[PDB]
Design a protein around this ligand. Structure first.
Ligand SMILES: C[C@H](NC(C)(C)C)C(=O)c1cccc(Cl)c1
Ligand SMILES: [Cl-]
Length: 553
Protein backbone atom coordinates (compact mmCIF):
# COMPACT_ATOMS: atom_id res chain seq x y z
CA UNK A 1 0.00 0.00 0.00
CA UNK A 2 3.06 2.24 -0.24
CA UNK A 3 2.06 3.28 -3.76
CA UNK A 4 -1.48 4.06 -2.56
CA UNK A 5 -0.32 6.84 -0.22
CA UNK A 6 1.84 8.33 -2.97
CA UNK A 7 -0.94 8.20 -5.56
CA UNK A 8 -3.42 9.78 -3.14
CA UNK A 9 -0.98 12.60 -2.37
CA UNK A 10 -0.32 13.34 -6.04
CA UNK A 11 -3.98 13.24 -7.11
CA UNK A 12 -4.95 15.47 -4.19
CA UNK A 13 -2.26 18.03 -4.95
CA UNK A 14 -2.83 17.89 -8.72
CA UNK A 15 -6.39 19.28 -8.49
CA UNK A 16 -7.09 22.69 -6.98
CA UNK A 17 -9.81 25.30 -6.98
CA UNK A 18 -7.59 26.96 -9.59
CA UNK A 19 -8.03 24.16 -12.14
CA UNK A 20 -11.79 24.06 -11.49
CA UNK A 21 -12.67 27.78 -11.28
CA UNK A 22 -9.89 29.97 -12.73
CA UNK A 23 -8.82 27.82 -15.68
CA UNK A 24 -12.32 27.73 -17.27
CA UNK A 25 -12.70 31.49 -17.70
CA UNK A 26 -9.06 32.10 -18.61
CA UNK A 27 -9.34 29.42 -21.30
CA UNK A 28 -12.65 30.82 -22.56
CA UNK A 29 -11.34 34.40 -22.56
CA UNK A 30 -8.13 33.42 -24.39
CA UNK A 31 -9.40 31.54 -27.44
CA UNK A 32 -9.65 28.01 -26.09
CA UNK A 33 -6.46 26.23 -27.16
CA UNK A 34 -4.43 29.21 -28.17
CA UNK A 35 -4.28 29.31 -24.36
CA UNK A 36 -3.34 25.63 -24.08
CA UNK A 37 -0.33 25.86 -26.42
CA UNK A 38 1.35 28.52 -24.23
CA UNK A 39 -0.01 26.70 -21.19
CA UNK A 40 1.71 23.43 -22.08
CA UNK A 41 4.92 25.16 -23.18
CA UNK A 42 5.24 27.11 -19.94
CA UNK A 43 4.07 24.14 -17.87
CA UNK A 44 6.96 22.01 -19.03
CA UNK A 45 9.68 24.60 -19.35
CA UNK A 46 9.14 26.67 -16.19
CA UNK A 47 6.52 24.95 -14.05
CA UNK A 48 8.08 21.51 -13.90
CA UNK A 49 11.60 22.67 -12.93
CA UNK A 50 10.31 25.28 -10.47
CA UNK A 51 7.89 22.86 -8.81
CA UNK A 52 10.75 20.38 -8.47
CA UNK A 53 13.07 23.08 -7.08
CA UNK A 54 10.55 24.27 -4.49
CA UNK A 55 9.86 20.71 -3.33
CA UNK A 56 13.58 19.94 -3.05
CA UNK A 57 14.27 23.18 -1.16
CA UNK A 58 11.49 22.54 1.34
CA UNK A 59 12.54 18.92 1.82
CA UNK A 60 16.26 19.52 2.29
CA UNK A 61 16.20 22.72 4.35
CA UNK A 62 13.32 21.74 6.68
CA UNK A 63 12.18 25.37 6.75
CA UNK A 64 9.17 27.40 5.66
CA UNK A 65 8.91 29.93 2.87
CA UNK A 66 10.67 32.72 4.77
CA UNK A 67 13.26 30.85 6.84
CA UNK A 68 14.45 28.60 3.99
CA UNK A 69 16.61 31.53 2.85
CA UNK A 70 19.30 30.85 5.44
CA UNK A 71 21.16 29.42 2.44
CA UNK A 72 21.25 32.96 0.98
CA UNK A 73 20.25 35.58 3.58
CA UNK A 74 19.56 38.30 1.00
CA UNK A 75 16.41 36.51 -0.27
CA UNK A 76 14.47 36.40 2.98
CA UNK A 77 12.83 39.38 1.30
CA UNK A 78 11.66 37.07 -1.49
CA UNK A 79 10.34 34.73 1.18
CA UNK A 80 8.38 37.57 2.76
CA UNK A 81 7.11 38.60 -0.68
CA UNK A 82 5.70 35.15 -1.39
CA UNK A 83 4.13 35.07 2.08
CA UNK A 84 2.47 38.43 1.39
CA UNK A 85 1.24 37.21 -2.00
CA UNK A 86 -0.30 34.17 -0.32
CA UNK A 87 -1.95 36.46 2.23
CA UNK A 88 -3.36 38.68 -0.53
CA UNK A 89 -4.72 35.72 -2.50
CA UNK A 90 -6.52 34.59 0.65
CA UNK A 91 -9.00 37.48 0.67
CA UNK A 92 -11.10 36.42 -2.34
CA UNK A 93 -10.57 32.65 -2.26
CA UNK A 94 -12.79 32.59 0.82
CA UNK A 95 -15.31 34.75 -1.06
CA UNK A 96 -15.41 32.16 -3.84
CA UNK A 97 -15.91 29.45 -1.21
CA UNK A 98 -18.75 31.53 0.26
CA UNK A 99 -20.35 31.65 -3.19
CA UNK A 100 -20.02 27.86 -3.39
CA UNK A 101 -21.64 27.48 0.03
CA UNK A 102 -24.51 29.77 -0.99
CA UNK A 103 -25.10 27.74 -4.14
CA UNK A 104 -25.06 24.50 -2.13
CA UNK A 105 -27.60 25.96 0.29
CA UNK A 106 -29.79 27.05 -2.63
CA UNK A 107 -29.50 23.59 -4.23
CA UNK A 108 -31.62 21.86 -1.55
CA UNK A 109 -34.89 22.13 -3.44
CA UNK A 110 -36.89 20.39 -6.16
CA UNK A 111 -36.98 23.57 -8.30
CA UNK A 112 -33.50 25.00 -8.74
CA UNK A 113 -33.53 28.83 -8.77
CA UNK A 114 -31.37 29.03 -11.91
CA UNK A 115 -33.65 27.01 -14.21
CA UNK A 116 -36.00 29.86 -15.14
CA UNK A 117 -36.83 33.44 -14.20
CA UNK A 118 -39.96 34.77 -12.55
CA UNK A 119 -38.50 35.19 -9.07
CA UNK A 120 -38.02 38.41 -7.11
CA UNK A 121 -34.44 38.81 -8.37
CA UNK A 122 -35.34 38.52 -12.07
CA UNK A 123 -35.32 41.67 -14.19
CA UNK A 124 -37.98 42.48 -16.81
CA UNK A 125 -35.40 41.77 -19.54
CA UNK A 126 -34.97 38.06 -18.72
CA UNK A 127 -35.33 35.66 -21.64
CA UNK A 128 -36.28 32.04 -20.93
CA UNK A 129 -35.50 29.59 -23.77
CA UNK A 130 -38.29 27.26 -22.62
CA UNK A 131 -40.97 29.91 -21.97
CA UNK A 132 -40.32 31.73 -25.27
CA UNK A 133 -39.12 31.09 -28.81
CA UNK A 134 -35.59 31.93 -27.68
CA UNK A 135 -29.27 41.70 -28.61
CA UNK A 136 -26.52 44.32 -28.33
CA UNK A 137 -24.65 42.20 -30.95
CA UNK A 138 -21.41 42.35 -28.91
CA UNK A 139 -22.44 42.10 -25.24
CA UNK A 140 -21.97 39.18 -22.84
CA UNK A 141 -25.76 38.58 -22.77
CA UNK A 142 -26.45 38.62 -18.98
CA UNK A 143 -30.20 38.00 -19.52
CA UNK A 144 -30.20 34.23 -19.05
CA UNK A 145 -31.89 32.76 -15.95
CA UNK A 146 -28.56 31.40 -14.69
CA UNK A 147 -26.68 34.67 -15.19
CA UNK A 148 -29.66 36.57 -13.78
CA UNK A 149 -29.57 34.42 -10.65
CA UNK A 150 -25.80 34.69 -10.23
CA UNK A 151 -25.69 38.46 -10.71
CA UNK A 152 -28.87 39.45 -8.86
CA UNK A 153 -29.88 36.88 -6.23
CA UNK A 154 -26.33 35.99 -5.18
CA UNK A 155 -24.04 38.97 -5.79
CA UNK A 156 -26.81 41.60 -5.87
CA UNK A 157 -24.53 43.31 -8.39
CA UNK A 158 -27.48 45.25 -9.81
CA UNK A 159 -27.37 47.58 -6.77
CA UNK A 160 -23.84 48.87 -7.54
CA UNK A 161 -22.80 51.37 -10.21
CA UNK A 162 -19.11 50.43 -10.12
CA UNK A 163 -16.11 49.97 -7.88
CA UNK A 164 -16.77 53.46 -6.49
CA UNK A 165 -20.19 52.41 -5.13
CA UNK A 166 -19.49 49.00 -3.62
CA UNK A 167 -22.07 49.57 -0.89
CA UNK A 168 -22.61 47.48 2.25
CA UNK A 169 -21.82 43.77 2.74
CA UNK A 170 -24.56 41.35 1.78
CA UNK A 171 -26.02 39.74 4.90
CA UNK A 172 -26.24 36.32 3.20
CA UNK A 173 -22.71 36.07 1.85
CA UNK A 174 -21.86 37.50 5.28
CA UNK A 175 -23.15 34.37 7.02
CA UNK A 176 -21.59 32.13 4.37
CA UNK A 177 -18.18 33.77 4.84
CA UNK A 178 -18.51 33.55 8.62
CA UNK A 179 -19.19 29.81 8.36
CA UNK A 180 -16.26 29.33 5.98
CA UNK A 181 -13.91 31.30 8.24
CA UNK A 182 -14.97 29.38 11.36
CA UNK A 183 -14.46 26.06 9.57
CA UNK A 184 -11.00 27.09 8.36
CA UNK A 185 -9.91 28.28 11.80
CA UNK A 186 -11.14 25.12 13.51
CA UNK A 187 -9.39 23.01 10.86
CA UNK A 188 -6.09 24.91 11.28
CA UNK A 189 -5.96 25.72 15.01
CA UNK A 190 -4.49 22.40 16.23
CA UNK A 191 -1.67 21.66 13.80
CA UNK A 192 -0.51 21.08 10.26
CA UNK A 193 -1.73 17.48 10.29
CA UNK A 194 -4.94 17.05 8.30
CA UNK A 195 -4.12 14.19 5.91
CA UNK A 196 -4.80 10.46 5.82
CA UNK A 197 -8.50 10.61 6.72
CA UNK A 198 -11.43 12.42 5.06
CA UNK A 199 -9.10 13.84 2.38
CA UNK A 200 -9.95 10.64 0.50
CA UNK A 201 -13.21 12.13 -0.80
CA UNK A 202 -11.85 15.65 -1.39
CA UNK A 203 -9.51 14.27 -4.09
CA UNK A 204 -11.59 11.59 -5.85
CA UNK A 205 -14.74 13.70 -6.21
CA UNK A 206 -13.28 16.30 -8.63
CA UNK A 207 -12.31 13.56 -11.09
CA UNK A 208 -15.74 11.92 -10.90
CA UNK A 209 -17.36 15.31 -11.52
CA UNK A 210 -15.10 16.00 -14.50
CA UNK A 211 -15.73 12.52 -15.92
CA UNK A 212 -19.52 12.78 -15.70
CA UNK A 213 -19.31 16.29 -17.16
CA UNK A 214 -17.40 14.95 -20.17
CA UNK A 215 -19.63 11.95 -20.83
CA UNK A 216 -22.82 14.00 -20.55
CA UNK A 217 -21.73 17.20 -22.30
CA UNK A 218 -20.31 15.31 -25.28
CA UNK A 219 -23.91 14.31 -26.08
CA UNK A 220 -25.60 17.71 -26.30
CA UNK A 221 -27.33 19.50 -29.20
CA UNK A 222 -24.59 22.13 -29.55
CA UNK A 223 -21.50 20.54 -27.99
CA UNK A 224 -20.08 19.74 -31.44
CA UNK A 225 -19.65 23.42 -32.31
CA UNK A 226 -18.13 24.11 -28.89
CA UNK A 227 -15.58 21.34 -29.42
CA UNK A 228 -14.82 22.61 -32.93
CA UNK A 229 -14.19 26.11 -31.57
CA UNK A 230 -12.06 24.56 -28.82
CA UNK A 231 -9.86 22.70 -31.32
CA UNK A 232 -9.31 25.75 -33.57
CA UNK A 233 -6.07 27.67 -32.97
CA UNK A 234 -5.89 31.40 -33.77
CA UNK A 235 -2.21 32.33 -33.91
CA UNK A 236 -3.02 36.03 -34.26
CA UNK A 237 -4.24 35.50 -30.69
CA UNK A 238 -0.85 33.97 -29.82
CA UNK A 239 0.82 37.15 -31.13
CA UNK A 240 -0.55 39.39 -28.33
CA UNK A 241 1.21 38.29 -25.06
CA UNK A 242 -2.04 38.49 -23.07
CA UNK A 243 -2.50 34.75 -23.53
CA UNK A 244 1.13 34.13 -22.54
CA UNK A 245 0.84 36.23 -19.37
CA UNK A 246 -2.42 34.50 -18.46
CA UNK A 247 -0.89 31.07 -19.06
CA UNK A 248 2.11 31.81 -16.85
CA UNK A 249 -0.01 33.21 -14.02
CA UNK A 250 -2.52 30.34 -14.18
CA UNK A 251 0.34 27.83 -14.19
CA UNK A 252 1.89 29.28 -11.05
CA UNK A 253 -1.62 29.35 -9.56
CA UNK A 254 -2.51 25.72 -10.26
CA UNK A 255 0.89 24.19 -9.50
CA UNK A 256 1.20 26.16 -6.25
CA UNK A 257 4.64 27.60 -6.99
CA UNK A 258 5.30 31.16 -5.88
CA UNK A 259 2.97 31.07 -2.85
CA UNK A 260 5.36 29.42 -0.38
CA UNK A 261 2.96 26.48 0.01
CA UNK A 262 5.21 23.85 -1.57
CA UNK A 263 8.21 24.71 0.61
CA UNK A 264 6.16 24.56 3.81
CA UNK A 265 4.47 21.31 2.77
CA UNK A 266 7.78 19.67 1.83
CA UNK A 267 9.42 20.79 5.08
CA UNK A 268 7.44 17.97 6.73
CA UNK A 269 8.28 15.36 4.08
CA UNK A 270 10.59 12.45 4.82
CA UNK A 271 14.23 13.26 4.09
CA UNK A 272 14.42 10.48 1.47
CA UNK A 273 11.11 11.24 -0.27
CA UNK A 274 11.25 11.38 -4.07
CA UNK A 275 10.56 14.91 -5.30
CA UNK A 276 11.27 13.96 -8.92
CA UNK A 277 8.38 11.49 -9.06
CA UNK A 278 6.16 14.01 -7.27
CA UNK A 279 6.92 16.68 -9.86
CA UNK A 280 6.48 14.38 -12.86
CA UNK A 281 3.19 12.86 -11.71
CA UNK A 282 1.70 16.15 -10.53
CA UNK A 283 2.59 17.98 -13.74
CA UNK A 284 1.28 15.19 -15.99
CA UNK A 285 -2.00 14.90 -14.08
CA UNK A 286 -2.36 18.69 -14.05
CA UNK A 287 -1.91 18.92 -17.83
CA UNK A 288 -4.38 16.11 -18.53
CA UNK A 289 -6.93 17.56 -16.10
CA UNK A 290 -6.60 21.01 -17.66
CA UNK A 291 -7.16 19.62 -21.15
CA UNK A 292 -10.22 17.65 -20.02
CA UNK A 293 -11.64 20.64 -18.13
CA UNK A 294 -11.26 22.86 -21.18
CA UNK A 295 -12.97 20.25 -23.34
CA UNK A 296 -15.94 19.94 -20.97
CA UNK A 297 -16.29 23.70 -20.47
CA UNK A 298 -16.28 24.41 -24.19
CA UNK A 299 -18.80 21.64 -24.84
CA UNK A 300 -21.12 23.14 -22.22
CA UNK A 301 -20.87 26.68 -23.56
CA UNK A 302 -21.35 25.47 -27.13
CA UNK A 303 -24.54 23.82 -25.92
CA UNK A 304 -25.56 27.15 -24.39
CA UNK A 305 -24.79 29.01 -27.62
CA UNK A 306 -27.07 26.59 -29.44
CA UNK A 307 -29.77 26.93 -26.77
CA UNK A 308 -29.82 30.74 -26.53
CA UNK A 309 -29.35 31.32 -30.29
CA UNK A 310 -26.33 33.48 -29.44
CA UNK A 311 -22.78 33.38 -30.79
CA UNK A 312 -20.38 31.23 -28.78
CA UNK A 313 -18.25 34.23 -27.79
CA UNK A 314 -21.19 36.02 -26.12
CA UNK A 315 -22.95 33.25 -24.17
CA UNK A 316 -21.20 33.69 -20.81
CA UNK A 317 -19.08 36.16 -18.88
CA UNK A 318 -15.31 36.15 -19.31
CA UNK A 319 -14.48 36.77 -15.64
CA UNK A 320 -14.96 35.11 -12.27
CA UNK A 321 -18.36 33.43 -12.17
CA UNK A 322 -18.08 31.60 -15.48
CA UNK A 323 -18.13 28.28 -13.62
CA UNK A 324 -21.09 29.44 -11.53
CA UNK A 325 -22.95 30.24 -14.76
CA UNK A 326 -21.83 27.05 -16.53
CA UNK A 327 -22.17 24.22 -14.03
CA UNK A 328 -25.77 25.13 -13.05
CA UNK A 329 -26.69 25.23 -16.75
CA UNK A 330 -25.26 21.75 -17.35
CA UNK A 331 -26.83 20.43 -14.14
CA UNK A 332 -30.28 21.66 -15.18
CA UNK A 333 -30.01 19.30 -18.18
CA UNK A 334 -29.13 16.23 -16.07
CA UNK A 335 -31.73 13.82 -14.78
CA UNK A 336 -32.28 14.33 -11.07
CA UNK A 337 -30.69 17.76 -11.23
CA UNK A 338 -30.98 18.27 -7.46
CA UNK A 339 -28.66 15.37 -6.61
CA UNK A 340 -26.08 16.49 -9.17
CA UNK A 341 -26.24 20.10 -7.95
CA UNK A 342 -25.68 18.94 -4.37
CA UNK A 343 -22.75 16.74 -5.40
CA UNK A 344 -21.12 19.40 -7.59
CA UNK A 345 -21.31 22.15 -4.98
CA UNK A 346 -20.18 19.82 -2.19
CA UNK A 347 -17.17 19.04 -4.38
CA UNK A 348 -16.56 22.76 -4.87
CA UNK A 349 -16.78 23.35 -1.12
CA UNK A 350 -14.32 20.54 -0.38
CA UNK A 351 -11.84 21.73 -3.01
CA UNK A 352 -12.05 25.35 -1.89
CA UNK A 353 -11.62 24.46 1.78
CA UNK A 354 -8.59 22.31 0.94
CA UNK A 355 -6.98 25.09 -1.10
CA UNK A 356 -7.71 27.79 1.50
CA UNK A 357 -6.34 25.55 4.25
CA UNK A 358 -3.19 24.98 2.21
CA UNK A 359 -2.62 28.68 1.65
CA UNK A 360 -3.37 29.67 5.24
CA UNK A 361 -1.07 26.92 6.54
CA UNK A 362 1.66 28.13 4.19
CA UNK A 363 1.37 31.66 5.58
CA UNK A 364 1.23 30.45 9.19
CA UNK A 365 4.23 28.14 8.84
CA UNK A 366 6.24 30.81 7.04
CA UNK A 367 5.60 33.38 9.76
CA UNK A 368 5.96 30.88 12.62
CA UNK A 369 9.32 29.43 11.62
CA UNK A 370 10.63 33.01 11.65
CA UNK A 371 9.35 33.89 15.15
CA UNK A 372 9.24 31.39 18.01
CA UNK A 373 6.60 33.38 19.92
CA UNK A 374 4.01 32.68 17.23
CA UNK A 375 5.10 29.03 17.15
CA UNK A 376 4.36 28.74 20.88
CA UNK A 377 0.90 30.32 20.37
CA UNK A 378 -0.47 28.69 17.22
CA UNK A 379 -4.05 29.26 18.39
CA UNK A 380 -3.82 33.03 18.84
CA UNK A 381 -1.73 33.50 15.70
CA UNK A 382 -4.18 31.46 13.63
CA UNK A 383 -7.09 33.44 15.08
CA UNK A 384 -5.41 36.73 14.19
CA UNK A 385 -4.56 35.69 10.64
CA UNK A 386 -8.05 34.29 10.08
CA UNK A 387 -9.71 37.43 11.47
CA UNK A 388 -7.61 39.69 9.23
CA UNK A 389 -8.51 37.52 6.23
CA UNK A 390 -12.17 37.65 7.27
CA UNK A 391 -12.18 41.45 7.33
CA UNK A 392 -10.31 41.84 4.04
CA UNK A 393 -12.78 39.38 2.48
CA UNK A 394 -15.68 41.30 4.00
CA UNK A 395 -14.33 44.05 1.79
CA UNK A 396 -15.06 41.76 -1.20
CA UNK A 397 -18.65 40.65 -0.44
CA UNK A 398 -20.30 44.05 -0.92
CA UNK A 399 -22.80 44.83 -3.67
CA UNK A 400 -19.95 45.87 -5.95
CA UNK A 401 -17.72 43.19 -4.48
CA UNK A 402 -17.19 41.49 -7.84
CA UNK A 403 -15.20 44.53 -8.98
CA UNK A 404 -12.91 44.33 -5.95
CA UNK A 405 -12.58 40.57 -6.45
CA UNK A 406 -11.60 41.12 -10.09
CA UNK A 407 -9.04 43.76 -9.12
CA UNK A 408 -7.51 41.40 -6.57
CA UNK A 409 -7.60 38.35 -8.85
CA UNK A 410 -5.77 40.43 -11.46
CA UNK A 411 -3.16 42.23 -9.33
CA UNK A 412 -2.52 40.24 -6.13
CA UNK A 413 -0.53 37.46 -7.83
CA UNK A 414 0.31 38.48 -11.38
CA UNK A 415 3.54 40.22 -12.20
CA UNK A 416 4.12 40.04 -8.43
CA UNK A 417 4.09 36.23 -8.32
CA UNK A 418 6.07 36.05 -11.56
CA UNK A 419 8.73 38.34 -10.07
CA UNK A 420 8.79 36.38 -6.80
CA UNK A 421 9.32 33.07 -8.62
CA UNK A 422 11.97 34.64 -10.86
CA UNK A 423 13.82 35.94 -7.80
CA UNK A 424 13.59 32.54 -6.09
CA UNK A 425 15.04 30.80 -9.15
CA UNK A 426 17.78 33.39 -9.63
CA UNK A 427 18.74 33.35 -5.96
CA UNK A 428 18.95 29.59 -5.65
CA UNK A 429 20.49 28.71 -9.01
CA UNK A 430 23.04 31.50 -9.31
CA UNK A 431 23.98 32.57 -5.78
CA UNK A 432 23.51 29.38 -3.76
CA UNK A 433 24.75 27.22 -6.63
CA UNK A 434 23.11 24.75 -8.99
CA UNK A 435 25.99 22.39 -8.20
CA UNK A 436 25.26 22.68 -4.48
CA UNK A 437 21.53 22.18 -5.10
CA UNK A 438 22.26 19.05 -7.15
CA UNK A 439 24.56 17.75 -4.42
CA UNK A 440 21.80 18.29 -1.85
CA UNK A 441 19.26 16.47 -4.04
CA UNK A 442 21.74 13.61 -4.45
CA UNK A 443 22.25 13.42 -0.68
CA UNK A 444 18.48 13.35 -0.17
CA UNK A 445 17.17 11.06 -2.91
CA UNK A 446 20.37 9.29 -4.03
CA UNK A 447 20.56 10.43 -7.67
CA UNK A 448 21.91 13.66 -9.14
CA UNK A 449 19.44 15.68 -11.25
CA UNK A 450 19.92 15.42 -14.99
CA UNK A 451 21.27 18.09 -17.30
CA UNK A 452 17.78 19.18 -18.38
CA UNK A 453 16.81 20.10 -14.82
CA UNK A 454 20.02 22.04 -14.18
CA UNK A 455 19.74 23.96 -17.45
CA UNK A 456 16.09 24.81 -16.79
CA UNK A 457 16.90 25.96 -13.26
CA UNK A 458 19.88 28.09 -14.23
CA UNK A 459 19.24 29.59 -17.68
CA UNK A 460 15.92 28.77 -19.34
CA UNK A 461 13.37 29.30 -16.57
CA UNK A 462 14.82 32.65 -15.38
CA UNK A 463 15.02 33.85 -19.00
CA UNK A 464 11.37 33.18 -19.85
CA UNK A 465 10.27 34.39 -16.42
CA UNK A 466 12.09 37.69 -16.97
CA UNK A 467 10.66 38.01 -20.47
CA UNK A 468 7.11 37.53 -19.19
CA UNK A 469 7.66 39.91 -16.27
CA UNK A 470 8.90 42.60 -18.66
CA UNK A 471 6.10 42.01 -21.16
CA UNK A 472 3.40 42.15 -18.48
CA UNK A 473 4.63 45.66 -17.57
CA UNK A 474 5.39 47.20 -20.97
CA UNK A 475 2.12 45.73 -22.34
CA UNK A 476 -0.51 46.34 -19.66
CA UNK A 477 -4.20 46.40 -20.55
CA UNK A 478 -6.38 48.59 -18.29
CA UNK A 479 -8.60 46.54 -16.02
CA UNK A 480 -12.16 45.77 -17.12
CA UNK A 481 -15.06 43.54 -16.09
CA UNK A 482 -17.02 42.47 -19.17
CA UNK A 483 -18.58 45.76 -20.33
CA UNK A 484 -17.43 47.81 -17.31
CA UNK A 485 -14.24 49.87 -17.61
CA UNK A 486 -12.51 50.47 -14.29
CA UNK A 487 -11.51 54.07 -13.47
CA UNK A 488 -7.78 54.87 -13.72
CA UNK A 489 -7.37 55.08 -9.94
CA UNK A 490 -8.46 51.44 -9.80
CA UNK A 491 -5.48 50.60 -12.01
CA UNK A 492 -3.24 52.70 -9.77
CA UNK A 493 -4.50 50.84 -6.69
CA UNK A 494 -3.93 47.49 -8.37
CA UNK A 495 -0.38 48.40 -9.33
CA UNK A 496 0.22 49.60 -5.78
CA UNK A 497 -1.03 46.25 -4.51
CA UNK A 498 1.38 44.43 -6.82
CA UNK A 499 4.29 46.67 -5.80
CA UNK A 500 3.53 46.21 -2.09
CA UNK A 501 4.78 42.62 -2.44
CA UNK A 502 7.23 43.22 -5.30
CA UNK A 503 9.27 45.79 -3.35
CA UNK A 504 9.97 43.69 -0.25
CA UNK A 505 12.99 42.14 -2.00
CA UNK A 506 15.13 45.27 -2.56
CA UNK A 507 13.99 46.73 0.76
CA UNK A 508 15.17 43.65 2.64
CA UNK A 509 18.42 43.55 0.65
CA UNK A 510 19.12 47.15 1.68
CA UNK A 511 18.18 46.42 5.30
CA UNK A 512 20.45 43.37 5.44
CA UNK A 513 23.34 45.30 3.88
CA UNK A 514 23.04 48.20 6.34
CA UNK A 515 22.52 46.00 9.40
CA UNK A 516 25.59 43.82 8.85
CA UNK A 517 28.90 45.02 10.28
CA UNK A 518 32.13 45.24 8.30
CA UNK A 519 33.39 46.61 5.01
CA UNK A 520 31.60 46.33 1.67
CA UNK A 521 33.22 43.04 0.69
CA UNK A 522 32.71 41.54 4.16
CA UNK A 523 29.06 42.65 4.15
CA UNK A 524 28.54 41.01 0.76
CA UNK A 525 30.25 37.84 1.97
CA UNK A 526 27.95 37.59 4.98
CA UNK A 527 25.00 38.39 2.71
CA UNK A 528 25.56 35.67 0.10
CA UNK A 529 27.09 32.94 2.27
CA UNK A 530 24.88 30.40 4.09
CA UNK A 531 24.33 31.12 7.77
CA UNK A 532 25.90 27.84 8.91
CA UNK A 533 29.10 28.65 6.96
CA UNK A 534 29.70 32.17 8.32
CA UNK A 535 32.92 30.92 9.94
CA UNK A 536 34.56 30.76 6.50
CA UNK A 537 34.06 34.50 5.90
CA UNK A 538 36.79 35.35 8.41
CA UNK A 539 39.07 33.00 6.45
CA UNK A 540 38.46 34.82 3.14
CA UNK A 541 37.24 31.66 1.37
CA UNK A 542 34.07 32.64 -0.51
CA UNK A 543 33.03 30.48 -3.44
CA UNK A 544 30.90 33.23 -5.00
CA UNK A 545 34.07 35.33 -5.39
CA UNK A 546 35.48 32.81 -7.90
CA UNK A 547 34.69 32.45 -11.59
CA UNK A 548 34.38 28.67 -11.26
CA UNK A 549 31.18 29.02 -9.22
CA UNK A 550 29.58 31.33 -11.79
CA UNK A 551 30.70 29.25 -14.81
CA UNK A 552 29.39 25.96 -13.38
CA UNK A 553 26.22 24.18 -14.50
C1 LIG B 1 -2.61 27.91 -5.23
C2 LIG B 1 -2.91 27.62 -3.76
N1 LIG B 1 -3.10 26.17 -3.57
C3 LIG B 1 -1.96 25.23 -3.75
C4 LIG B 1 -0.65 25.87 -3.31
C5 LIG B 1 -1.84 24.78 -5.21
C6 LIG B 1 -2.24 24.01 -2.88
C7 LIG B 1 -4.17 28.37 -3.32
O1 LIG B 1 -5.25 28.08 -3.81
C8 LIG B 1 -4.04 29.46 -2.33
C9 LIG B 1 -2.89 30.24 -2.24
C10 LIG B 1 -2.80 31.26 -1.32
C11 LIG B 1 -3.85 31.53 -0.47
C12 LIG B 1 -5.00 30.77 -0.56
CL1 LIG B 1 -6.33 31.12 0.50
C13 LIG B 1 -5.11 29.75 -1.49
CL1 LIG C 1 -4.55 24.81 -14.40
Amino acid sequence: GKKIDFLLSVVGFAVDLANVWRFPYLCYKNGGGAFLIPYTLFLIIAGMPLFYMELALGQYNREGAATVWKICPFFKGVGYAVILIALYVGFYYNVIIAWSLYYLFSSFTLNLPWTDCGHTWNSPNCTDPKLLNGHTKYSKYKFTPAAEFYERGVLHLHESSGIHDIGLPQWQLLLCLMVVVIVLYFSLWKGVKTSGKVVWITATLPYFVLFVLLVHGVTLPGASNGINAYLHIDFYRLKEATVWIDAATQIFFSLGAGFGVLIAFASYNKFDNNCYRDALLTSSINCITSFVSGFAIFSILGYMAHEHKVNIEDVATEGAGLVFILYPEAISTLSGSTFWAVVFFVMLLALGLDSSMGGMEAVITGLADDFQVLKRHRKLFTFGVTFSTFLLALFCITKGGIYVLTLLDTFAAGTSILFAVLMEAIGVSWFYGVDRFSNDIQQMMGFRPGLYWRLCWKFVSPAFLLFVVVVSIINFKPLTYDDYIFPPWANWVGWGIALSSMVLVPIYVIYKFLSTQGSLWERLAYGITPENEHHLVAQRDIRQFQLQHWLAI
